[PDB]
Design a protein around this ligand. Structure first.
Ligand code: HEM
Length: 258
């Protein structure tokens, strides 16, 4: 009858806190987790939780996200439990996931409240963006340890850019993040370049720093010449949606129009 839930991602953990739910394990993260989970044990990093540690807690439900569904299949196999891959790649997707979590875990009122808040902020920002005369063309880079990718409309940051009134210069939509070389970056004309870090932020920012100094293509971008290359904080600007999308939407709108 009772649920023993283990969220494997920081976004899921913060979502279950907004839903007023207890959990039995939590991800290993450098990020701030809700205070109420201070004492629950860590189960390893989101992308590779410890199979042995998760089993130990006798969970009823182990939760993951759409963004890494394929890379998580072996984990769930070894766990020998049902895969849960909540869509956290857009506001609409996360809204659906929140409703689903509310239904699964008897938190329908709490889910509706959070969804209503996020919907209200989204609508308000989209309303403001509609009234803007100009809309920046935007290139979004997602830096990970060793390399950087380009974010599409299918990624959370892509959705945020769209909501805030930006036009993503990357038009391909079949995956969330694409290689630095999938679309050619000489064929785009962005007003704004956004750089988001992941996994190892310190290493990523010095990597972006060195890339922009050493790869000749960047000096020629007008966003670079006009000082509109922005390094975004991984919190609220992460690799998936999170319940602090209200802050992310508001902050991005304010960066675009100031
Ligand atoms: C390139 C090598 C990569 C490395 C070494 C890496 C490493 C990490 C690390 C260290 C974390 C935990 C950060 C924390 O302490 O909270 C994390 C989280 C995560 N990563 Fe990556 N990452 C990489 C690329 C990617 C890519 C390409 C994706 C998929 C688009 C991805 C998806 C995720 C997701 C969904 C989480 C959980 C986010 C959350 O906790 O809400 N990672 N990764």
């Amino acid at each position: 009858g009772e649920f023993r839930i283990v969220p494997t991602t920081v976004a899921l953990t913060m979502t279950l806190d907004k839903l007023d739910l207890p959990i039995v394990g939590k991800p290993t993260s450098y990020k701030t987790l809700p205070n109420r989970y201070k004492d629950v044990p860590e189960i390893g990093q989101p992308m590779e939780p410890n199979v042995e540690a998760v089993k130990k807690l006798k969970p009823t439900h182990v939760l993951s996200v759409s963004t890494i569904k394929d890379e998580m299949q072996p984990f769930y196999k070894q766990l020998n439990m049902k895969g849960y891959f909540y869509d956290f790649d857009s506001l609409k997707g996360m809204q659906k996931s929140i409703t689903q979590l509310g239904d699964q875990f008897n938190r329908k009122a709490q889910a509706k409240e959070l969804n209503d808040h996020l919907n209200s902020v989204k609508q308000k920002i989209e309303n403001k963006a509609a009234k803007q005369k100009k809309h920046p063309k935007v290139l979004i880079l997602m830096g990970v340890p060793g390399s950087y990718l380009v974010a599409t409309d299918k990624s959370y940051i892509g959705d945020l850019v769209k909501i805030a009134g930006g036009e993503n210069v990357i038009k391909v939509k079949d995956r969330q993040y694409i290689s630095s070389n999938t679309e050619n970056l000489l064929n785009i004309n962005p007003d704004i370049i956004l750089r988001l870090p992941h996994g190892m932020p310190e290493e990523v920012k010095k990597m972006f720093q060195k890339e922009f100094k050493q790869n000749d293509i960047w000096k020629h971008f007008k966003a670079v010449k006009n000082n509109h290359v922005y390094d975004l904080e991984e919190v609220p600007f992460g690799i998936t949606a999170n319940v602090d999308a209200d802050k992310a939407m508001t902050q991005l709108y304010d960066l675009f129009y100031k």
